[PDB]
Amino acid sequence: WQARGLGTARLQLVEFSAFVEPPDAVDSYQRHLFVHISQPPLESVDVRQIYDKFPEGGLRELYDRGPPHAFFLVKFWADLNWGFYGVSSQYESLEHMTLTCSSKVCSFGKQVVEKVETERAQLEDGRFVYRLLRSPMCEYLVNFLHKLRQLPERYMMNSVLENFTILQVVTNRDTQELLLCTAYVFEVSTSERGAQHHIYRLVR
Ligand SMILES: *C(#N)N1[C]C2=C([C]1)C([N]C1=[C]C(C(F)(F)F)=[C][C]=[C]1)=[C][C]=[C]2
């Protein structure tokens, strides 16, 4: 009954990216992905080890109310060499729901920006999809990339990214119940390698 991917029986994640398109993309399009998830049981990380990096809206509260199986950790190795900055998310379910998608950016485990969005069902192939596509990146985060990208040393980037975390909570708006809560922790990938992720189940 343990998850094989990032999702529950009640809300799969299909794809997720954050990307930059250069102003030169109007003529000859190209995409650069800082992070990307496109979609044997997932490896397991104790939720108590990563309380310190998120508020106390907090990870402890949200796991306490549950459900435990909805909680996931993604480590990202960002690709940080490369305009419009966008984040695209897509989800699926078998229910018609209305989704509310709360993205908390935390620096040293304090909330620094929050984004909250709604997306309603679109029935496609017996399936409900929720397309949150090309949402413009929050200005702090685009600034946090340009500043982070000019660091002399990648261990400096990881040192900064050590204290930079993001908490996404996806809830049915109507029923107010939690569907999917994802903890993001960041490293920089080396320049020759592109973006990577490892996805864990948060347990207790
Ligand atoms: C703001 N803040 N944002 C616009 C937005 C965001 C961030 C997310 N969350 C998210 C962002 C990243 C990355 F920093 F861009 F890599 C990684 C994971 C989650 C989601 C939707 C819109």
Side-chain angles (χ1 to χ4, degrees), residues 16 18 35 87 103 105 115 135-138 141 166 168 184 186:
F16 166 88
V35 303
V87 178
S103 293
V105 166
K115 182 272 303 176
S135 173
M137 218 189 279
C138 320
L141 205 75
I166 291 177
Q168 271 190 314
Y184 298 105
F186 297 88

Side-chain angles (χ1 to χ4, degrees), residues 4-132:
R4 269 85 187 187
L6 195 143
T8 67
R10 202 173 172 192
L11 189 65
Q12 307 92 308
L13 163 90
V14 180
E15 198 187 38
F16 166 88
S17 73
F19 67 88
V20 55
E21 297 165 344
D24 213 45
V26 164
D27 307 69
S28 189
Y29 176 77
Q30 193 204 6
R31 190 152 95 161
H32 175 77
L33 305 162
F34 314 108
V35 303
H36 182 224
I37 309 178
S38 182
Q39 298 195 143
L42 287 168
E43 267 152 83
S44 156
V45 166
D46 183 337
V47 84
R48 298 184 272 231
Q49 296 295 69
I50 58 172
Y51 281 145
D52 50 282
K53 256 171 295 301
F54 302 102
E56 274 69 14
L59 188 54
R60 178 84 201 172
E61 154 185 310
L62 288 160
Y63 204 86
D64 287 18
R65 62 170 270 194
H69 68 290
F71 284 64
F72 297 81
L73 173 65
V74 182
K75 196 199 263 160
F76 277 133
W77 291 266
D79 191 1
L80 275 202
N81 80 164
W82 71 88
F84 166 74
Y85 287 77
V87 178
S88 299
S89 312
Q90 181 167 354
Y91 300 120
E92 271 172 340
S93 66
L94 285 186
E95 298 192 19
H96 190 297
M97 278 150 18
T98 325
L99 288 197
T100 309
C101 310
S102 316
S103 293
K104 311 188 169 62
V105 166
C106 308
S107 189
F108 305 73
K110 81 188 285 295
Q111 211 174 277
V112 171
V113 192
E114 182 169 20
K115 182 272 303 176
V116 188
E117 278 169 327
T118 291
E119 200 70 353
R120 94 175 75 260
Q122 274 153 349
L123 185 120
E124 302 190 355
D125 205 76
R127 267 247 185 68
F128 287 106
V129 310
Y130 313 72
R131 278 188 198 85
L132 295 76

